[PDB]
Amino acid sequence: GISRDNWHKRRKTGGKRKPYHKKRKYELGRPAANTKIGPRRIHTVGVRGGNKKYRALRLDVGNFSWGSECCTRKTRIIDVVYNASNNELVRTKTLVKNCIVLIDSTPYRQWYESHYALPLGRKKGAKLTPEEEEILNKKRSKKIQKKYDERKKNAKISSLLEEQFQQGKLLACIASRPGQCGRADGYVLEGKELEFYLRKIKARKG
Amino acid sequence: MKLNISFPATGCQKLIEVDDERKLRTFYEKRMATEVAADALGEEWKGYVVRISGGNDKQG
Amino acid sequence: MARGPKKHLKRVAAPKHWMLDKLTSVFAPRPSTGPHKLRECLPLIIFLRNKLKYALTGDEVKKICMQRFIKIDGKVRADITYPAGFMDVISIDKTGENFRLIYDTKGRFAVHRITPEEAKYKLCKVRKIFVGTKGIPHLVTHDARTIRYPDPLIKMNDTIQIDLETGKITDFIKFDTGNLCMVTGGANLGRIGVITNRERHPGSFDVVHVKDANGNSFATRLSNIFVIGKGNKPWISLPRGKGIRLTIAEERDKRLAAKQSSG
RNA sequence: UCGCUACUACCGAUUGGAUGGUUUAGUGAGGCCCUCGGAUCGGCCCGCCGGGGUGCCCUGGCGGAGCGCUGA
RNA sequence: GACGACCCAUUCGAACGUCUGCCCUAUCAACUUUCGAUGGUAGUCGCCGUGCCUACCAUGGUGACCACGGGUGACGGGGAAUCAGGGUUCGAUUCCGGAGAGGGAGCCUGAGAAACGGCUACCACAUCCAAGGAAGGCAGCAGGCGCGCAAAUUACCCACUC
RNA sequence: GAAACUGCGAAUGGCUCAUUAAAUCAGUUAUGGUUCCUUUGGUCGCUACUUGGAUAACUGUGGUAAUUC
Ligand SMILES: [Mg+2]
Ligand SMILES: [Mg+2]
Ligand SMILES: [Mg+2]
Ligand SMILES: [Mg+2]
Ligand SMILES: [Mg+2]
Ligand SMILES: [Mg+2]
Ligand SMILES: [Mg+2]
Ligand SMILES: [Mg+2]
Ligand SMILES: [Mg+2]
Ligand SMILES: [Mg+2]
Ligand SMILES: [Mg+2]
Ligand SMILES: [Mg+2]
Ligand SMILES: [Mg+2]
Ligand SMILES: [Mg+2]
Ligand SMILES: [Mg+2]
Ligand SMILES: [Mg+2]
Ligand SMILES: [Mg+2]
Ligand SMILES: [Mg+2]
Ligand SMILES: [Mg+2]
Ligand SMILES: [Mg+2]
Ligand SMILES: [Mg+2]
Ligand SMILES: [Mg+2]
Ligand SMILES: [Mg+2]
Ligand SMILES: [Mg+2]
Ligand SMILES: [Mg+2]
Ligand SMILES: [Mg+2]
Ligand SMILES: [Mg+2]
Ligand SMILES: [Mg+2]
Ligand SMILES: [Mg+2]
Ligand SMILES: [Mg+2]
Ligand SMILES: [Mg+2]
Ligand SMILES: [Mg+2]
Ligand SMILES: [Mg+2]
Ligand SMILES: [Mg+2]
Ligand SMILES: [Mg+2]
Ligand SMILES: [Mg+2]
Ligand SMILES: [Mg+2]
Ligand SMILES: [Mg+2]
Ligand SMILES: [Mg+2]
Ligand SMILES: [Mg+2]
Ligand SMILES: [Mg+2]
């Protein structure tokens, strides 16, 4: 079937080479996965030596990380925004390594408000009266100075990141190959990477 | 065509030959694993329910 | 043609230090996978039926081994193509005799009966020192043995004497200039001497010099040195000749002048 | 030079033939992958009986309903 | 004791790479390139490195020191015949390596196969049929037809080597 | 102890030289860029006095000109 052999190529001089043998099995095919977004399905391929290998199709949940905070959570993947290799991989919402994805951003908000005792980007406060000010402004006399005042000074999320938390989504990069592992892990963009990718996105579409 | 009747209660089988197509009209155009009333195959068969389980073509 | 691993060995392609004929047949024992490499081992059938003449065919050595008589390094081996190798100990207690496979002088194994008190330990060369989970130091010796928790001052190319019954490294000799050694590969396969030098070529094949007990010098690669003593004092018992390699002229003079024909 | 016999190679209408090797364009068996498909086969949940307990429950069996969920 | 088993090391390998080494031919002097040619970035796939393949860029790469094309009654080597010194010719063939099972192609199982003493199709042959259907691969050992100037028994045995 | 289920082997060996001209192959090195049944050595603790249904062989009825159907 499909083959990865070197012997169908021209040699460096531009000359043809003639084959000496039929196609082997250590030179195999196995067409692409083309992971979409949706309810999970994962098939399993038997490869050289045994060693099953998981090929994902329609993943919808990932394990992403925030490196400044060292805080990693399970999250939902919403959409793909950028793709350095092709552009038809954003029209079809296929999810490959080094893609740029939107995630749900909620568990990071939960951990942040719980760890710092301080809010994210919030517009108005009425929902904070029955609940959430319960977490953020917890009724305790011990700790609530000594601990959380050492949590403060450090709780200075940058302009772009705190602007992200308002619309309820983030920008993340996949750092794992879902076609080989069946997992869509990665890390949320920050700093100059975030600026570069935001400018690229703004420049491409529209 | 012939039939191979099997009673899974007492463990007894018997082959039967039936030529007149009228008796056979009960089974025509009916896939395997469907139960029918075999009381059309005779008068000893009155309150009988049979399940088709397979067979062989001409040429086997 | 060759879609998998092979399992036959032709008599003409077998190692030469087995000292086989060329008229018995097309085939050779083909030692089974073990702790010693294929070209550097000595199967059980060849050691028993060819060097010891205890057996006369392959059936006889099979039915000698199938009676739990032969012990290699303490344990009872039932296979007749087991790859016994350097510094091993054979034990046949039905007759009360123990041997030790060591190259004599001419690049082949000898028959080297030893005392039963000496057939308890064996010397092993260290090839690898790595750390496992939870920071446990491991060893790897020249015969695939793995030792956990060695004292953290034994390194590569050092020799360790181990008890055959329990593992449990007992003592060790250090690779240094001045230590007795036997060469276990190449052209000087069998000669014994002191180190006196170690040339170093970063990236490939650091060579080592040797000078035996008669002022003769010869070099080898570091991959073939085997420290067997502190210096001028072996830890295992040396065979007859003691790796001296007297030349063909001296060979002829000693074979003629002694008139070694019979008793 | 012309003439006789014999042998060899050449040009050539025949728009020759045989065997092939590439090859535009069109079709395309069969396997593999993906998205569907759903012939059939079971389990779960409710009465009567047999076995155990407190009119009901548990294994099982029977006829069945809802065939509702459900797995291959 | 037997068996089984995740992982690491060892053994037996397998695969992909480095440097150097080749018969005749110019009545073969320029070749290669969206039908990847040479390189760059991101990926797909693969046991893994890699234009292996895709997207976007750059315009490169080889050659008179013989590239590129053609021929070989060319499998390579260890080796064989001849030989003052140098050389010339041979190596289908018992050891090592490669390739194939009528010709191509595609797969299952498996640690390991693109396996043919396995399977599925097309082409070429060819067998039985109750004409609906079924079955095939001796470049294994014997044997047979054909081809030729040209090459053996349809024998006995696992006693030896494995 | 027949048969049958199960485990393993059938990728070795044997044969031939059609293809193949930096291809194979030979000496030399590299996997710090990979996989490896088996062998040898290390590793084995974060209704339980033992669970479920269901197929062979075997018994019995058959189909086809014909098969290791
Ligand atoms: Mg070929
Ligand atoms: Mg494995
Ligand atoms: Mg072979
Ligand atoms: Mg063997
Ligand atoms: Mg004439
Ligand atoms: Mg054509
Ligand atoms: Mg097509
Ligand atoms: Mg198709
Ligand atoms: Mg690239
Ligand atoms: Mg890459
Ligand atoms: Mg150019
Ligand atoms: Mg050329
Ligand atoms: Mg050519
Ligand atoms: Mg040829
Ligand atoms: Mg030649
Ligand atoms: Mg000469
Ligand atoms: Mg040859
Ligand atoms: Mg030929
Ligand atoms: Mg021959
Ligand atoms: Mg090779
Ligand atoms: Mg083949
Ligand atoms: Mg043929
Ligand atoms: Mg297996
Ligand atoms: Mg094939
Ligand atoms: Mg074969
Ligand atoms: Mg067959
Ligand atoms: Mg055959
Ligand atoms: Mg023949
Ligand atoms: Mg003739
Ligand atoms: Mg002749
Ligand atoms: Mg003849
Ligand atoms: Mg035999
Ligand atoms: Mg028995
Ligand atoms: Mg086995
Ligand atoms: Mg197998
Ligand atoms: Mg022959
Ligand atoms: Mg050529
Ligand atoms: Mg080369
Ligand atoms: Mg080589
Ligand atoms: Mg080489
Ligand atoms: Mg083990």
Structural class of chain C: mainly beta
Task: Supply Rg of chain B.
Answer: 12 Å
What is the strand arrangement across the widest sheet of chain C?
A: 7-6-5-8-9
Instruction: Look up the CATH topology of the largest domain in chain C.
Output: Structural Genomics Hypothetical 15.5 Kd Protein In mrcA-pckA Intergenic Region, Chain A
Distance between the termini of chain C: 55 Å
DSSP, total strands of chain B: 4
How many domain modules of chain C? Answer: 3
CATH class of the largest domain in chain C: Alpha Beta
In whole angstroms, the N-to-C terminal distance of chain B is 12 Å
Strand content of chain B: 25-35%
Which H/E pattern describes the elements of chain C?
HHEEEEEEEEEEEEEH
Task: State the fourth-level CATH superfamily of the largest domain in chain C.
Answer: RNA-binding S4 domain
The largest sheet of chain B is: 2 strands, antiparallel
- Number of H/I helices of chain B: 1
Measured as a percent range, the helix fraction of chain C is under 10%
Rg of chain C, Å, rounded: 20 Å
Succession of helices and strands of chain B:
EEHEE
Q: Which structural class do you get from the secondary structure elements of chain B?
A: mainly beta
- Sheet with the most strands: spatial strand order of chain B: 1-2
- Overall spatial form of chain B: globular
TL;DR?
This is part of a larger assembly, with chains A (206 residues), B (60 residues) and C (263 residues). Chain B has one helix spanning 21-24; strands at residues 2-7, 12-17, 35-37, 49-51. Chain B is mainly β.
Give your account of this protein's structure.
The structure is cut from a larger assembly and holds chains A (206 residues), B (60 residues) and C (263 residues). With 206 residues, chain A is of the alpha+beta class. Chain A is 24% helix and 22% strand. A five-stranded antiparallel beta sheet of chain A has the order 3-4-5-6-7. A two-stranded antiparallel ribbon of chain A has the order 1-2. Chain B contains one helix and four strands. Chain B starts with a strand and ends in a 9-residue tail after the last strand. Chain C has three domains: 2-117, Structural Genomics Hypothetical 15.5 Kd Protein In mrcA-pckA Intergenic Region, Chain A (Roll), CATH 3.10.290; 122-172, Ribosomal protein S4, central domain (OB fold (Dihydrolipoamide Acetyltransferase, E2P)), CATH 2.40.50.740; 175-245, SH3 type barrels. Chain C is globular and about 50 Å long. The chains hardly touch. The complex binds magnesium ion (MG) (41 copies). One magnesium ion binds next to strand 2 of chain A. Chain A binds three RNA strands through residues 1-34, 43, 46-51, 57, 83-89, 96-99, 177, 179-180.
